[PDB]
Amino acid sequence: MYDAIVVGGGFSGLKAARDLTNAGKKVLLLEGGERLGGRAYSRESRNVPGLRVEIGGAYLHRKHHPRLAAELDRYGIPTAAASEFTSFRHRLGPTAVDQAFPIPGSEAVAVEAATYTLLRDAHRIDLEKGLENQDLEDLDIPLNEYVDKLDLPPVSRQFLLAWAWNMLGQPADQASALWMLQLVAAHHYSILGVVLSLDEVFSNGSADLVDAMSQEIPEIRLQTVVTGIDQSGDVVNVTVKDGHAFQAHSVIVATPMNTWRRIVFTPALPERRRSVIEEGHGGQGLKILIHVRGAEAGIECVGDGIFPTLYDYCEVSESERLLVAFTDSGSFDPTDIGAVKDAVLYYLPEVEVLGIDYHDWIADPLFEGPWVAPRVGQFSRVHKELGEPAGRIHFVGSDVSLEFPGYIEGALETAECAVNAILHS
């Protein structure tokens, strides 16, 4: 019997389990997989033997992510500034300029006006109240309709759409405008900031921080899949797939939102949460690492291709590199290499694709999705509650962070909040 059982060994669970430990509590961390880190997954490249790649969460920005920064400072984890872009190869039409900010002057007045509308709209969201408690329904519509209302000329329109596709992991017709404004809000009410937060990387991968953190957790069970969390008795009983149950005064669910439906909760969770939990969020982010020949360093491409963005990731040799493409799994099949060639050649006709590397987050039973993105209409029905305690069971993780959802920083923030709650209750 434990003071707390933490279910899930991504950053959320790891921080929770460690902080509770250091506070003097008796803590058990249960991880379903064979590794720690969750959606922060560094490993050897499938294409380049010996090369260590981030297959999920990679980037941070110290100004926007103070908790993460403090983790890095705590353990002396080195960070390098992310791959700089010297070469611009956009597909935004003939009037675009080949630089990082490709808007031409002919569009400046329009961009000015949209910047006001977007920020006005984002200034409606208060980041503590929850997206369902602020009469924001009018905004919770498909992104494409919202962007059609803005009436943007071609370059800025497509530029906005491409990054929106990248960041949200959803085509414009499935993405919620409200959620886009939520990301704008989370970045100190900045549209620009949403892209400028790709500022830094882990010099040796996320696993450095994963290991530094796990060092301080005395009890961890890998390969342990929780299937039931039962709080009907005086002490919470946690049921596991293959073996003896575990019990604790408190349980922290630190698993991905889309996996919650695979656990039996007793009693059943508060009913307002149930339909969203059953359908899952709509995130379909697809990140592909593309092994290439013939690409010069520092390329960045944004445009109207099936890869909204494609840019430099890593140097492999003097002739070979890794590029990264973002798109979504409903729109693109990464196992279709011809398709990948076409998507790449569209921006970079001189570039030869050697191979691809990715992780199928959706098909992974321990995840059932990459980062969170709500379906249209979801989060104006229920959002804040999803991360609220139901009795003695707490819910944490990037997925339910109000402050920085979809980012490592969000995983850390929700954890902090659960820890403090437990240290009083």
Ligand X SMILES: Cc1cc2nc3c(=O)[nH]c(=O)nc-3n(C[C@H](O)[C@H](O)[C@H](O)COP(=O)(O)OP(=O)(O)OC[C@H]3O[C@@H](n4cnc5c(N)ncnc54)[C@H](O)[C@@H]3O)c2cc1C
- Told to check if 115 binds its own copies by CB under 8 A, we report yes
Q: Which does 70 bind (CB under 5 to 8 A by kind): ligand LDP, ligand GP7, ligand X, none?
A: none
User: Does the protein bind ligand GP7 through residue 154 (CB under 6 A)?
Assistant: no
Residues between 135 and 174 that touch ligand LDP (CB under 6 A): 166-167
CA 424 to each of CA 220, 235, 238, 301, 389: distance values in angstroms, whole numbers, following the listed order: 24, 17, 22, 50, 14
Look at residue 205 and give the partner it binds from its own copies, ligand LDP, ligand X, none, a contact being a CB closer than 5 to 8 Å depending on partner kind. Answer: none
Q: Among candidates 293, 210, 250, which has minimal Cα distance to 391?
A: 250
Query: At 44, which helix (H) or strand (E)?
Result: strand 42-44
Nearer to ligand X, 12 or 380 (CB): 12
Alpha carbons 152 and 94: distance in angstroms, whole number: 16
Please name the residue that has the structure tokens 């919470």: 236
Quick one: how far is CA 155 from the chain centroid? 27
**Ordered alpha helix ranges (H), 50-107:** 66-75
Q: How far is the CB of 12 from ligand GP7 (least distance, A)?
A: 23
Evaluate the CA torsion angle 146, 152, 158, 164 in order and state its sign.
Answer: negative
Q: CA geometry: angle at 419 spanning 414 and 420, to 5°?
A: 100
Which of 27, 191, 220, 418 binds its own copies (CB under 8 A)? It is 191
For position 9 contacting ligand X by CB under 6 A, the verdict is: yes
Shortest CB 285 distance to ligand LDP, Å: 6
**What's the alpha-carbon Rg for the chain, to the nearest Å?**
22
The CA-atom distances, in angstroms, between 171 and each of 57, 121, 167, 297, 330 are: 20, 21, 10, 29, 9
- Is 12 among the annotated ligand-binding positions? yes
Alpha-carbon distance values, 375 to 167, 175, 279, 283, 378 (Å): 15, 7, 9, 8, 5
171 binds ligand X (CB under 6 A): no
Least Cα distance to 80 among 196, 198, 203, 197 occurs for 203
Residue 390 marked as a ligand binder: no
Using the rule CB under 6 A, is 371 a contact of ligand LDP?
Answer: yes
**Taking CB under 6 A as the rule, does residue 32 contact ligand X?**
yes
Residues in 84-113 at the binding interface with ligand GP7, rule: CB under 6 A: 97, 99-101, 103-106, 108, 111-112
Residue of 23, 80, 192, 235 interacting with ligand GP7 (CB under 6 A): 192
Task: Identify which of residues 54 and 107 has a Cβ nearer to ligand GP7 in the complex.
Answer: 107
Q: How far is the CB of 111 from its own copies (least distance, A)?
A: 9
- Alpha carbons 101 and 109: distance in angstroms, whole number: 15
**From residue 283 to residue 312, what is the string marking binding to ligand LDP with x (rule CB under 6 A)?**
--x---------------------------
| Closer by beta carbon to ligand X, 96 or else 254 | 254
Decide if residue 180 touches ligand GP7 (CB under 6 A).
yes
Q: Is 191 in the site for ligand GP7 (CB under 6 A)?
A: yes
- With CB atoms as reference, the residue minimizing the distance to ligand LDP is 406
Q: Which of residues 59 and 346 has its CB atom nearest to ligand LDP in the complex? A: 59
Q: What is the DSSP string of 303-366?
A: BSSSSSEEEEEEE-SSSEEEEEEEEETTT--TT-HHHHHHHHHHH-TTPEEEEEE---TTT-TT
Tokens of 69: 């920064």
Q: Whose Cβ is closer to its own copies: residue 119's or residue 390's?
A: 119
∠ Cα 7 212 226 (to 5°): 10
Residue showing tokens 């009693």: 267
Give me the 61-100 binding string for its own copies, x by CB under 8 A, dash otherwise: ---------------------------------------x
371 is in an annotated binding site: yes
Size of the site for its own copies (CB under 8 A): 18
Q: Which is nearer to its own copies, 15 or 61 (CB)?
A: 61
For 244, the token pair is 């003896």
373 binds ligand GP7 (CB under 6 A): no
Backbone angles phi, psi at 95, to 5 degrees: -90, -10
d(CA 201, CA 230): 40
Name the DSSP class of 70.
H
Q: Is 59 annotated as a binding residue?
A: yes
321 binds ligand X (CB under 6 A): no
Interface ranges with its own copies (CB under 8 A): 100-101, 105, 108-109, 112-113, 115-116, 119-120, 123, 189-193, 196
**Residues tagged in the binding site annotation for FAD:** 12, 31, 38-39, 56-59, 226, 398, 406-408
Annotated binding site: 12, 31, 38-39, 56-59, 166, 226, 311, 326, 371, 398, 406-408
Binding site for ligand GP7 (CB under 6 A): 97, 99-101, 103-106, 108, 111-112, 114-115, 156, 159-160, 163-164, 167, 180, 183, 191-192, 194-195
